[PDB]
Design a protein around this ligand. Structure first.
Ligand SMILES: *[C@@H]1O[C@H](CO[C@H]2O[C@@H](C)[C@@H](O)[C@@H](O)[C@@H]2O)[C@@H](O)[C@H](O[C@@H]2O[C@H](CO)[C@@H](O)[C@H](O)[C@H]2NC(C)=O)[C@H]1NC(C)=O
Ligand SMILES: *[C@@H]1O[C@H](CO[C@H]2O[C@@H](C)[C@@H](O)[C@@H](O)[C@@H]2O)[C@@H](O)[C@H](O)[C@H]1NC(C)=O
Ligand code: CU
Ligand code: CU
Length: 691
């Protein structure tokens, strides 16, 4: 396993030949070993990698999609970089290239002849087709969209299209015989290069390529002046005006490997080196990013400048981006099924118990709300990226991270006013006031104070929640200035921590002693109530929760047996000034103000999410038209499932529609600062995917 020699998969004769020369300058620099396997096509390459007969292959976005699917489940490990040394970029522009003289806009291509890089390819098929869907009058399954494309343009070249079913798609392929319109070099008109040629040769009226092809293939620059682009706003502009004129901005090709025992480091090292020795202009012996006058893009893209390593949290789905990923699956959808999905809100539920309540809510939503699930919040943030889930209510800590992931706050949870209104009929426009983070202890614990909580046992909501962690740990951090957060207290129950750390030391898992230290309600000590249960059961010595938590859980405010007999007066708060106060004085005895939990989504889901959540609260809200004979959206009672049980309503954001503006300057400064002690894999994945 983990390495030795990495078997690359060639898809061509001249790829094997380059793969073989590579094999050789490598051990001849006494570098890491690359051995080569052969096949006729990208999927044979995908099958091989999956049946362990090869380890890697650089695929186009289109095949990364394909490759991620079962029973493959292959992962991008390295992305190619484009542009130049410092203007390096892991993405390109799908453009629509035409010759000057004609005037016909991208809305005027019906009956035109077209040249495609190849079926299933990003700029060549996926985008241009996904872009003109409107005009195609397509019926939807089971009629392949190919049939609709074949009926749109007069004749086309699309390497890989079915000759037989789809005659016209191959029509202008220039290959000879069984080679006519094939997904290989045997076809003069394949890939970015063949497709531009098709255009050049008069064969096609439009070429659906990458933005660099005309610069890579037309030397004299007055030669280049014979083309222009078709902009999406039904315009025409210079081939160099591509940042202002492109169909899409897609992810660069990536090297994919198995995601089980994939030899990811074996692969990274070999790439890391080769790129050193033989990368852009260095060591003539060989050239990793160049192709013998005959061929083009052998094994990798002509003129790539290196590789960029794909952080492990990333999969096909996250690799592709929701926009794109979703776009490939919509090509196998009716414009009905596609509009159904759009109007529908997919909720992400953390753990089983929230799913139950989700199902339940779903059942009563008149199909507006459907449910999704994951075991952690982070996993739930990822399905929203994948466009596979659409929203969840989150604690401010996570709003930061989703935020970095590009999601935006949509509505915030509203709680019992500064004692402003009554069952405030105006709780949709009442600006939020955030909640109070506080440290609680047993009254009994006289001697315990702010100043001497350190090195004792702590109870936390979970790692990365405002009250529960950011605040307590950020304040202490600001003193000692240490990153060894597992040395602040002797033992804790901080769910979502290393089950092996001291920080999980006091977690109890589920009713069966399993699920211990998990960051969901199946851990008995998880969340607000859990953190408090931790204290009241003398597991921990302080509990980091909010004030309302003690109220809500004592004096038959909570009927769980754990909580029954607990009386408010038995607990106290710890002030930053070394004093101690009673739970009623939290307004003057709290660590800080936490921002209200907020519901986050993709920008594309916003207005509709708003509409649905608003409609739906009207019916199962606090004083809810169906609440509570039918369903109380805001109750799980003592569990804060999907929403905090104390939500008066979901209110409007008063213009703070950025994680930054919502969370505020100081708050974000602070998380960042804590984030450097260490970043989550998700934050790592989102940085990578952000540049
Ligand atoms: C796409 O549809 C438009 C209009 O949509 C409908 O056209 C109706 C007339 C019915 O047949 C519907 O069932 C149909 O889908 C079509 O206009 C368009 O192709 C037509 O363009 C043709 C070329 O000029 C022309 O022969 C027709 O006059 C024209 N529509 C009009 C005004 O009827 C379809 N484009 C396709 C299928 O690619
Ligand atoms: C947060 O840090 C601020 C900087 O002063 C602290 O810096 C340490 C290095 C140490 O010498 C301490 O004297 C200071 O507390 C500080 O002025 C703020 O009071 C700090 N506390 C909070 C939680 O705000
Ligand atoms: Cu490509
Ligand atoms: Cu919170």
């Amino acid at each position: 396993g983990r390495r030795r020699s990495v078997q690359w998969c060639a898809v061509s004769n001249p790829e094997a030949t380059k793969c073989f020369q590579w094999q050789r300058n490598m051990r001849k620099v006494r570098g890491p070993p690359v051995s080569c396997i052969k096949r006729d096509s990208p999927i044979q390459c995908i099958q091989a990698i999956a049946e362990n007969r090869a380890d890697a292959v650089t695929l186009d976005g289109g095949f990364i999609y394909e490759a991620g699917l079962a029973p493959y489940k292959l992962r991008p490990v390295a992305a190619e970089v484009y542009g130049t040394e410092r203007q390096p970029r892991t993405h390109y522009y799908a453009v629509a290239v035409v010759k000057k003289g004609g005037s016909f806009q991208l809305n005027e291509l019906q009956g035109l002849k077209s040249c495609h890089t190849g079926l299933r390819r990003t700029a060549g098929w996926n985008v241009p087709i996904g872009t003109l869907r409107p005009f195609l009058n397509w019926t939807g399954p089971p009629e392949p969209i190919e049939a609709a494309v074949a009926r749109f343009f007069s004749a086309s070249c699309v390497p890989g299209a079915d000759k037989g079913q789809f005659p016209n798609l191959c029509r202008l392929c220039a290959g000879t015989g069984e080679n006519k319109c094939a997904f290989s070099s045997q076809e003069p008109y394949f890939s970015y290069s063949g497709a531009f040629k098709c255009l050049r040769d008069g064969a096609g009226d439009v070429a659906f390529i990458r933005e660099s092809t005309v610069f890579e293939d037309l030397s004299d620059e007055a030669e280049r002046d014979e083309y222009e682009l078709l902009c999406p706003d039904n315009t025409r502009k210079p081939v160099d005006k591509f940042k202002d004129c492109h169909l899409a901005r897609v992810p660069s090709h990536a090297v994919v490997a198995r995601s089980v025992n994939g030899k990811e480091d074996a692969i990274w090292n070999l790439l890391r080196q080769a790129q050193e020795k033989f990368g852009k202009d260095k060591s003539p012996k060989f050239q990793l990013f160049g192709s013998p006058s005959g061929q083009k893009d052998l094994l990798f893209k002509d003129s790539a400048i290196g590789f960029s390593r794909v952080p492990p949290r990333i999969d096909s789905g996250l690799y592709l981006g929701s926009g794109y990923f979703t776009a490939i699956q919509n090509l196998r959808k009716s414009e009905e099924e596609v509009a159904a999905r759009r109007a529908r809100v997919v909720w992400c539920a953390v753990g089983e118990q929230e799913l139950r309540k989700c199902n339940q809510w779903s059942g009563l939503s008149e199909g507006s709300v459907t449910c999704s699930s994951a075991s952690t919040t982070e996993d739930c943030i990822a399905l929203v990226l994948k466009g596979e889930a659409d929203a969840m209510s989150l604690d401010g800590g996570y709003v930061y991270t989703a935020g970095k992931c590009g999601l935006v706050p949509v509505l915030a949870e509203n709680y019992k006013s500064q004692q402003s209104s009554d069952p405030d009929p105006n709780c949709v426009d009442r600006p939020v006031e955030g909640y109070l983070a506080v440290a609680v202890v047993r009254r009994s614990d006289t001697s315990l104070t702010w100043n001497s909580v350190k090195g004792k046992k702590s109870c936390h909501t979970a790692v990365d929640r405002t009250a529960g962690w950011n605040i307590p740990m950020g304040l202490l951090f600001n003193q000692t200035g240490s990153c060894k957060f597992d040395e602040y207290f002797s033992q804790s129950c901080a769910p979502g921590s290393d089950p092996r750390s001291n920080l999980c030391a006091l977690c109890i898992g589920d009713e069966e002693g399993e699920n211990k230290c998990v960051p969901n309600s199946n851990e008995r000590y998880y969340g607000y109530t859990g953190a408090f249960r931790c204290l009241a059961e003398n597991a921990g010595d302080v509990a980091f929760v909010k004030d309302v938590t003690v109220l809500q859980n004592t004096d038959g405010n909570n009927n769980e047996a754990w909580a029954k007999d607990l009386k408010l007066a038995d607990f106290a708060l710890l002030c930053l000034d070394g004093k101690r106060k009673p739970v009623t004085e939290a307004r003057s005895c709290h660590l800080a103000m936490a921002p209200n939990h907020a519901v986050v989504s993709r920008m594309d889901k916003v207005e509709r999410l708003k509409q649905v959540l608003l409609h739906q609260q009207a019916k199962f809200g606090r004083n809810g038209s169906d609440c509570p004979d039918k369903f109380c959206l805001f109750q799980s009672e003592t569990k804060n499932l999907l929403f905090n049980d104390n939500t008066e309503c979901l209110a409007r954001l008063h213009g703070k529609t950025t994680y930054e503006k919502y969370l505020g300057p100081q708050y974000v400064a602070g998380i960042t600062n804590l984030k450097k002690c260490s970043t989550s894999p998700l934050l790592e994945a989102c940085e990578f995917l952000r540049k």
